[PDB]
Amino acid sequence: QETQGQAAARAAAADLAAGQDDEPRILEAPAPDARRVYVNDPAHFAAVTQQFVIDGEAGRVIGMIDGGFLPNPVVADDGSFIAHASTVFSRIARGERTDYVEVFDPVTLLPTADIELPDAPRFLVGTYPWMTSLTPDGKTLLFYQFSPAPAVGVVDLEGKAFKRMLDVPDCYHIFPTAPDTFFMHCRDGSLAKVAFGTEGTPEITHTEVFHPEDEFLINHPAYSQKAGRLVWPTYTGKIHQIDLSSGDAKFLPAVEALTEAERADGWRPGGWQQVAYHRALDRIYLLVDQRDEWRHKTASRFVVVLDAKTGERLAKFEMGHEIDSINVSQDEKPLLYALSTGDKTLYIHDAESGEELRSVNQLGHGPQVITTADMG
Amino acid sequence: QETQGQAAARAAAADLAAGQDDEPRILEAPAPDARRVYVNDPAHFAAVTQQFVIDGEAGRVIGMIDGGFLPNPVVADDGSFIAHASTVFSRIARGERTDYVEVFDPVTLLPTADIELPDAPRFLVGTYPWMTSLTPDGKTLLFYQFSPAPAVGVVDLEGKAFKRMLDVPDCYHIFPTAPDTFFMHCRDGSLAKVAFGTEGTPEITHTEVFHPEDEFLINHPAYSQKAGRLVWPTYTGKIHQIDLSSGDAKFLPAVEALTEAERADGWRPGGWQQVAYHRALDRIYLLVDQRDEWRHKTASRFVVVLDAKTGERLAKFEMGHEIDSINVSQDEKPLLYALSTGDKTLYIHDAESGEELRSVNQLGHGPQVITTADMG
Amino acid sequence: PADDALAALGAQLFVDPALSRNATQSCATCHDPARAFTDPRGDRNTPTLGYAALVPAFHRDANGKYKGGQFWDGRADDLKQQAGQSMLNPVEMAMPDRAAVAARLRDDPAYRTGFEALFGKGVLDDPERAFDAAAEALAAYQATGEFSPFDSKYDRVMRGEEKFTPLEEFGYTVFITWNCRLCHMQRKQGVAERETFTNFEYHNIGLPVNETAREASGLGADHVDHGLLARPGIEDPAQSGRFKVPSLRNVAVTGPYMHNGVFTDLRTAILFYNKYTSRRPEAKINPETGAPWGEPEVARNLSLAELQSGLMLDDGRVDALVAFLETLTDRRYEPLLE
Amino acid sequence: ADDALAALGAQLFVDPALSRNATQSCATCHDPARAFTDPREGKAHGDRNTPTLGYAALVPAFHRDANGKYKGGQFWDGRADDLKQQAGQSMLNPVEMAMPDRAAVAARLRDDPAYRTGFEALFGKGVLDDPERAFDAAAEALAAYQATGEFSPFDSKYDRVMRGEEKFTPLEEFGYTVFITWNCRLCHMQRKQGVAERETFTNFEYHNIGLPVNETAREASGLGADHVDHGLLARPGIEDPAQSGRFKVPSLRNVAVTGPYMHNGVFTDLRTAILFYNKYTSRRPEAKINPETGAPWGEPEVARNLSLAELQSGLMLDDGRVDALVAFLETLTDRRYEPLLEE
Amino acid sequence: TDPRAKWVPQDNDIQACDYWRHCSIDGNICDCSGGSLTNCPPGTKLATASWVASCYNPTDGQSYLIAYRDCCGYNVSGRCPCLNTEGELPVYRPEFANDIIWCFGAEDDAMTYHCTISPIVGKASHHHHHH
Amino acid sequence: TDPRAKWVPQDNDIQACDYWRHCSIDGNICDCSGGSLTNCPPGTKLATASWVASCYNPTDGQSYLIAYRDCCGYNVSGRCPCLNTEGELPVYRPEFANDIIWCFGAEDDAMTYHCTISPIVGKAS
Ligand code: HEC
Ligand code: HEC
Numbered sequence A, B: 001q002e003t004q005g006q007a008a009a010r011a012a013a014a015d016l017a018a019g020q021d022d023e024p025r026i027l028e029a030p031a032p033d034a035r036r037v038y039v040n041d042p043a044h045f046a047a048v049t050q051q052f053v054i055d056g057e058a059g060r061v062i063g064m065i066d067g068g069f070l071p072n073p074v075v076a077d078d079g080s081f082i083a084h085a086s087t088v089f090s091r092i093a094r095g096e097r098t099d100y101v102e103v104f105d106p107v108t109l110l111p112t113a114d115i116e117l118p119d120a121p122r123f124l125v126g127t128y129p130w131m132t133s134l135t136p137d138g139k140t141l142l143f144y145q146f147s148p149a150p151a152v153g154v155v156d157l158e159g160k161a162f163k164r165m166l167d168v169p170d171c172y173h174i175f176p177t178a179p180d181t182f183f184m185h186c187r188d189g190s191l192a193k194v195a196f197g198t199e200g201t202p203e204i205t206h207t208e209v210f211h212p213e214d215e216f217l218i219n220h221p222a223y224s225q226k227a228g229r230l231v232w233p234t235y236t237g238k239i240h241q242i243d244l245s246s247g248d249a250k251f252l253p254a255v256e257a258l259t260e261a262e263r264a265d266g267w268r269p270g271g272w273q274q275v276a277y278h279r280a281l282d283r284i285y286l287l288v289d290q291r292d293e294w295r296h297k298t299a300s301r302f303v304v305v306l307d308a309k310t311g312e313r314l315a316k317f318e319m320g321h322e323i324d325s326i327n328v329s330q331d332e333k334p335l336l337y338a339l340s341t342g343d344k345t346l347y348i349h350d351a352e353s354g355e356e357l358r359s360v361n362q363l364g365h366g367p368q369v370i371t372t373a374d375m376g
Numbered sequence C: 001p002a003d004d005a006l007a008a009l010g011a012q013l014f015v016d017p018a019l020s021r022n023a024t025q026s027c028a029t030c031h032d033p034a035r036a037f038t039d040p041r042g043d044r045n046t047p048t049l050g051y052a053a054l055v056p057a058f059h060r061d062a063n064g065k066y067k068g069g070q071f072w073d074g075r076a077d078d079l080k081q082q083a084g085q086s087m088l089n090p091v092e093m094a095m096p097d098r099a100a101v102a103a104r105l106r107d108d109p110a111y112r113t114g115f116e117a118l119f120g121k122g123v124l125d126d127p128e129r130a131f132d133a134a135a136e137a138l139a140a141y142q143a144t145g146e147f148s149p150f151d152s153k154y155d156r157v158m159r160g161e162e163k164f165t166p167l168e169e170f171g172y173t174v175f176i177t178w179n180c181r182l183c184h185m186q187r188k189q190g191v192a193e194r195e196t197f198t199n200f201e202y203h204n205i206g207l208p209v210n211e212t213a214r215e216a217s218g219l220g221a222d223h224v225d226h227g228l229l230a231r232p233g234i235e236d237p238a239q240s241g242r243f244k245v246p247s248l249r250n251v252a253v254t255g256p257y258m259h260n261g262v263f264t265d266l267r268t269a270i271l272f273y274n275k276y277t278s279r280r281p282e283a284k285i286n287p288e289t290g291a292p293w294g295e296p297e298v299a300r301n302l303s304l305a306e307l308q309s310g311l312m313l314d315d316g317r318v319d320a321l322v323a324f325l326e327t328l329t330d331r332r333y334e335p336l337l338e
Numbered sequence D: 001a002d003d004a005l006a007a008l009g010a011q012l013f014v015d016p017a018l019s020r021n022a023t024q025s026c027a028t029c030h031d032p033a034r035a036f037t038d039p040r041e042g043k044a045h046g047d048r049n050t051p052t053l054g055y056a057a058l059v060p061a062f063h064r065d066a067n068g069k070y071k072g073g074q075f076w077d078g079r080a081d082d083l084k085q086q087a088g089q090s091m092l093n094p095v096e097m098a099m100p101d102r103a104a105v106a107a108r109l110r111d112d113p114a115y116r117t118g119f120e121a122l123f124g125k126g127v128l129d130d131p132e133r134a135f136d137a138a139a140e141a142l143a144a145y146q147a148t149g150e151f152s153p154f155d156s157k158y159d160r161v162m163r164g165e166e167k168f169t170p171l172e173e174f175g176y177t178v179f180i181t182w183n184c185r186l187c188h189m190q191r192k193q194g195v196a197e198r199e200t201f202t203n204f205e206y207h208n209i210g211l212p213v214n215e216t217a218r219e220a221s222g223l224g225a226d227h228v229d230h231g232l233l234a235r236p237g238i239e240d241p242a243q244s245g246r247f248k249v250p251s252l253r254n255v256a257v258t259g260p261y262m263h264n265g266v267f268t269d270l271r272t273a274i275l276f277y278n279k280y281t282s283r284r285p286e287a288k289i290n291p292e293t294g295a296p297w298g299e300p301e302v303a304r305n306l307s308l309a310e311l312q313s314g315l316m317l318d319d320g321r322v323d324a325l326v327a328f329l330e331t332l333t334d335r336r337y338e339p340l341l342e343e
Numbered sequence E: 001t002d003p004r005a006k007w008v009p010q011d012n013d014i015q016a017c018d019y020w021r022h023c024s025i026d027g028n029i030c031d032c033s034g035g036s037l038t039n040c041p042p043g044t045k046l047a048t049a050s051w052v053a054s055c056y057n058p059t060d061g062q063s064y065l066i067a068y069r070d071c072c073g074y075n076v077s078g079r080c081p082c083l084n085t086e087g088e089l090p091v092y093r094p095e096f097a098n099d100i101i102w103c104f105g106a107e108d109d110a111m112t113y114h115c116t117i118s119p120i121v122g123k124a125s126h127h128h129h130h131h
Numbered sequence F: 001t002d003p004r005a006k007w008v009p010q011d012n013d014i015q016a017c018d019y020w021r022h023c024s025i026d027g028n029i030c031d032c033s034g035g036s037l038t039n040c041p042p043g044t045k046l047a048t049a050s051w052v053a054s055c056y057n058p059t060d061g062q063s064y065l066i067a068y069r070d071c072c073g074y075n076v077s078g079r080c081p082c083l084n085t086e087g088e089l090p091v092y093r094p095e096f097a098n099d100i101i102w103c104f105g106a107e108d109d110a111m112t113y114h115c116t117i118s119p120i121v122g123k124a125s
């Protein structure tokens, strides 16, 4: 009802009338909690970019973080820190490149580490959350390199140092499952398990091929590290689920997020972060709309919600805006976050009823990525 | 009728049908000429910014130049080079500050000099063209400093080296008149002549005080270095004209851009670059509108044209758009440039009839400053 | 009744040399009402008693900053404790003990009358009760309107009764926009009801020793004045060299300036702040001596975050600040400004 | 004229009378059974490898383009303007036919009565009595024969696939896609943009890709340890030092059947030729080892003027993409040479 | 919405450009990027320099000196942009000028503009600008 | 207009996002910042890497392989932004993937994205 600007005016006016003093100072953000939500703006490939830290309950910006060109954000699930890998140049977008990792305190937002990555080794790509990833203990950050060949960089956040590049096969994305192990998805349609050391060839093993070459797996799968659950939609809304919880891949039954009647009438997923997964409810949420087969990065106006174990549809929400990315908070009665790149606005919905509750606008130039911590 | 993109489609299609080959390459911009116009986008205080190089005759972007935080552009009048003083930081908007001058070749747009300015000496302010200025011979760039006190830095563009800071009195802006002399405007209402040696404190001489403490001279006067003509409107549209061509200041009779009746009905100049001056026609152009006395930075929708000699009004144009800045090309049959910060669009007008000829849109985030060369 | 009578007893004490070691001087000798309760004629400079009653009692605030109290080093909690300290202080009244004070009070029939009416029969035969009562009376007197009249030009302008001159207006605007308001304003924001141009905090602004005063004190060339750390019970080494922010009311008539009286002219005190901001050679020089200011007496804990503002005061701004600070002169002292 | 002139060139092409001691013909070294190259150099004195004559008739005449790039011509160093000039050079070349002078060539042509008839019908009575006219006519004939369909049939699987008659295998198709998106397209495509009518997988320019000396060939040539093959700078009349070490980009048609590879035959295997380009892009130690020797590739013979802008692409071909490129380049084999792919 | 009309202050929403204390703000309102009306967001540095305006508060009819302060060291926030210029004077009267980036004194030499706060520091007016 | 409708190519205006050669462009059209359909603007560096799409040309009914290249080393142009994904496959098929910054090979190691050019390299097959 009363907006935050209006409540603040009412309070400042009462302070003034009462003669209440207060010292102008640098605020702390509120403590990280399950309803904090981060939105990253890659700004349609601009040389500098912004992250917005938002209290999802209040629909309020509580902080920002500046970044360089197409940085990769991560957020520790336990709330203890956030970090990114980022790239700057000595004359805006020209000159000497420096890539680096910063770690930030999640309340003061001050950098607590700034770790240079030798030889400018980051992969510059429109932002994919699982192209840079934390190990479950938070001590290591792993980032992807494409040039000259697929490789994964290992950064020791505890010791605040780069460690080494690992050579991998022709594979992509990084889903860590342990201090020394992560999985990747390979061109051949296998997953690769890579287990590594401080020195030495890593031990790399493959699953069998789990999808044929004409079934396309999107660049924004959902991965719950705490559940070990990799949720990987294809262009038609077929969803692979892989359970990495035992440390080896076990595969679950594939489900369809769309019915055969819907797919015959042109319904397909589309957007950027098209899929979210709620760990405690074991529920999948997918952005979908009626679209041509090659309009797979356009916004969508609907989200289907399904039970990950059976595939049953539990809801189909009309979001009422052009939504490019979704995610959910991981608490009991979660919020469903719906970010519109075109509106530069985060819409915050009740994930159970689908109802829009509040929104936060003016989020940069082309905001695309939502990250939440799973604190529970 | 046929647009640039349509013409280009037709040429491409003709090349394909004829089997014409061509090598993909880096184009050169067309030679600088009287109708080239530069638009600088301070981007409402963003840490990085852009300049657009535009052919005013065709209404075509022919190149761009990246800049740091609130850079100051300058354009050699003879078309031989362009330059700016700019500022970058080691971590986007935080960390170590570097200020520097770059000089660019005006056809390849490549930097031909990058001259570090020691001790981060630039004045950071919403952009004022005459806060950084070339001497008439092109060999020297002078920039203003405000902290810890008003000062002017001397940069040798020929030797590609910063030289020294000159201490000045409590004065603002830099109007060079000779390889070793420039004028400034002082808080006390005088202009200061500053003549500077190789070493030495400069020789500083004040003019008489030429305006009262309650008449306010805008931050964007027009200055024709080739004419030695300083055109300085006040908030009410009274115009001060100072002739610097003998090397000393001769105050020309003041002229009123608005009538008494217009001023009683609320007309005042307002915007950013509110005033333009055409040297060959000896004509003054002023952005005006009906506004409250304290809305002096809002856009205006009209331009009045007056004879600099008589003050006689020559023209009053309805621009058709919310315009913040004006300038003119310096050739015969000049163009009148009308930039809207809100529309991010440069409107290009016939100066004589005031009719809109063409426009160039998408000029960044908050474009504000138009610069032309006086090549005649 | 007792409000008025208590202050009136303090008014009598304040001018009585019988309160000094050898009956030579009164509180009025050094804190002369004709010169804004400072000395018109020890190592620290005598501060004004005007507006001292507006200072809060000494405390540590919730951010760890100390505020309030009396003396340059805050070593008295409030004006009553200060008066008791003053009566026994070798650099103020220098009485040897509380019994000697009571004995002087007993010698005077009007004091037997005045003190007994307020504190009870026999008060002056009990040296502890006698001394405490005298300090209570001296404190009550200093809390009267006469010591804090709020009748300066500044006051009149803020009440809308008159206007600043252009020069005074410029100086007010500089004061409230430049770093002076970080320390010489009561509040962080909002409007004070009784502004006295001090936030009552303790800061080291890095002053040099006043050589000639130090020599005349007999403290020794090896003495260092540690400011607030010298207050008994303060042991925090971060307080070493910090002094209470003085109220700027009546500043134009209470030279010389700073805790040790090192600068004789108000303009010099203002120019001192340019040593932290200006690049010009002259900013390094004390104009009263033609020599460098001198190294800080205590070279730690300087308030560099407030002092290194990045902006130099040109001479026009210094003239404006002088004009503005002269408007903080109580009405009665305006004649002293010529 | 046209049929008859090529038919006269067909006879000359196989005639050992055109060689110094009458021991070999053009077809000896340019063997029609092996895409007009020399079986003896295969897994089957100068130190340059014998190039294919197939598709050489599509090369433009030698010229300097307006950007200052030389293009066109024949031989590895471009020193013949076109096929006719190459043939006259070949007749007199110590490493090809090795005849001592034009008179000697005219004298062999006169010994043959079918030549008196065939040459006189095309060039006029008395042609073979004028050594200059006889030798020019022979070169013209040879060049006409090389311009016939037989040398440039455009019937490789690639050609059939472009005509819609067949599809690539998935591996050949990935190979083609890599070829057209990676740096290979910058030098082994006829055009900079648009579509070629008769693509021969060369832009006919001259580049130094920084190959080492083939030591055994060089030893055998007797040229000397201090010899340097300067490529295009050895063309008479080229004096620009920037052309040292540049050689003509070869057509990749029939590449799979015309090993060994490069201007000096230094690599036996097609896969080695492709792997060589990773020495400019990969960080792996294996990238600088020639897999046929287990030793470093070697210092370039000519250190200067390397095409580093095209070669240092920032991207390494993994083994999958190397396999795919081999598969695609095998589709460029003319139909009549497909049986050769087995061995 | 008429940009050239006399500005009309309100005292009911601090995130709007017509809130009375924003009479001479230039930039972005800190309350919209995790600061508040008189405090900077986390990670930014509070300048010690300031500019002043006498802004009329329509609630109590009093004119208050607002000594604006910048929060520095981050790229501009891009939320809640505003530019007002009540009594704003040209650069040569800098204590009233608002195109200057008033980041002097900020910790760590921070000089980039992120947003501006609007604290009251006095109840007064100016000769050039009074209600 | 309808963002989800099948993309409809034209061969009449290269600055528009439905120009037929732009069928898998991601970024900005170089002709809008001082380059042309197939050349980079002054001051930028032409990458040697590419990604390919088969784009239908409605002028002649032929599909052509467009081997896009980026012009690198400047901040993104901000003029004529477009994103089309005809045949565009995910990142593990990089030769058809268009979120990657294909600035490899550009002079002076330039890797920032300014705009993309749309040259033809073949007929589709
Ligand atoms: C010989 C001169 C002298 C006499 C007599 C004297 N004082 Fe002081 N007074 C001083 C000096 C010097 C100081 C500063 C001492 C310090 O800070 O340690 C001072 C400090 C004070 C202060 C501290 C105010 C502040 O802002 O810190 C008060 C209150 C005061 N005196 C009241 C008295 C009273 C009441 C008497 C009579 C009982 C008195 N003084 C007698 C010299 C004198
Ligand atoms: C960091 C806090 C701080 C700042 C900022 C500051 N002052 Fe002070 N000022 C003090 C303290 C503390 C003293 C007493 C220092 C001492 O004697 O040890 C003082 C003393 C003075 C005095 C002498 C008063 C007396 O009774 O002896 C004057 C005058 C003065 N300040 C004016 C200014 C002006 C004008 C400005 C702005 C140019 C300014 N100050 C900025 C803290 C500050």
Ligand code: HEC
Binding pocket: D013, D018, D024, D025, D026, D027, D028, D029, D030, D048, D049, D050, D051, D052, D053, D056, D074, D075, D076, D077, D083, D086, D087, D090, D091, D095, D096, D097, D142
């Ligand atoms: C003894 C082997 C041998 C004989 C016989 C021979 N050649 Fe060659 N040919 C070569 C070699 C080796 C080269 C490469 C020489 C070089 O580039 O300098 C070559 C090059 C060529 C080329 C250049 C092709 C290209 O792509 O650069 C043509 C054309 C040619 N020969 C045609 C002929 C003709 C026609 C004859 C018969 C008149 C002939 N050759 C006889 C070995 C031979």
Ligand code: HEC
Binding pocket: D182, D183, D184, D185, D186, D187, D188, D206, D207, D208, D209, D211, D246, D247, D248, D249, D250, D251, D252, D255, D258, D260, D261, D262, D263, D264, D270, D273, D274, D277, D307, D310, D311, D325
């Ligand atoms: C900078 C131009 C350039 C680039 C890029 C280039 N090549 Fe070459 N290629 C050459 C030249 C020149 C030669 C002949 C070199 C020599 O022998 O001196 C050559 C020779 C070859 C040969 C041996 C052919 C023969 O008949 O001996 C093969 C196979 C080859 N290239 C394949 C490729 C492939 C596949 C790529 C992409 C990975 C590629 N090339 C990239 C210029 C290029």
Ligand SMILES: [Ca+2]
Binding pocket: C038, C045, C046, C047, C254, C255, C256, C257, C258
């Ligand atoms: Ca004093």
Ligand SMILES: [Ca+2]
Binding pocket: D037, D049, D050, D051, D258, D259, D260, D261, D262
């Ligand atoms: Ca060969």
Ligand code: NA
Binding pocket: C210, C211, C212, C213, C262
């Ligand atoms: Na002294």
Ligand code: NA
Binding pocket: C228, C229, C230, C231, C232, C233, C234, C235
């Ligand atoms: Na102590």
Ligand code: NA
Binding pocket: D214, D215, D216, D217, D266
């Ligand atoms: Na060999």
Ligand code: NA
Binding pocket: D232, D233, D234, D235, D236, D237, D238, D239
């Ligand atoms: Na030569």
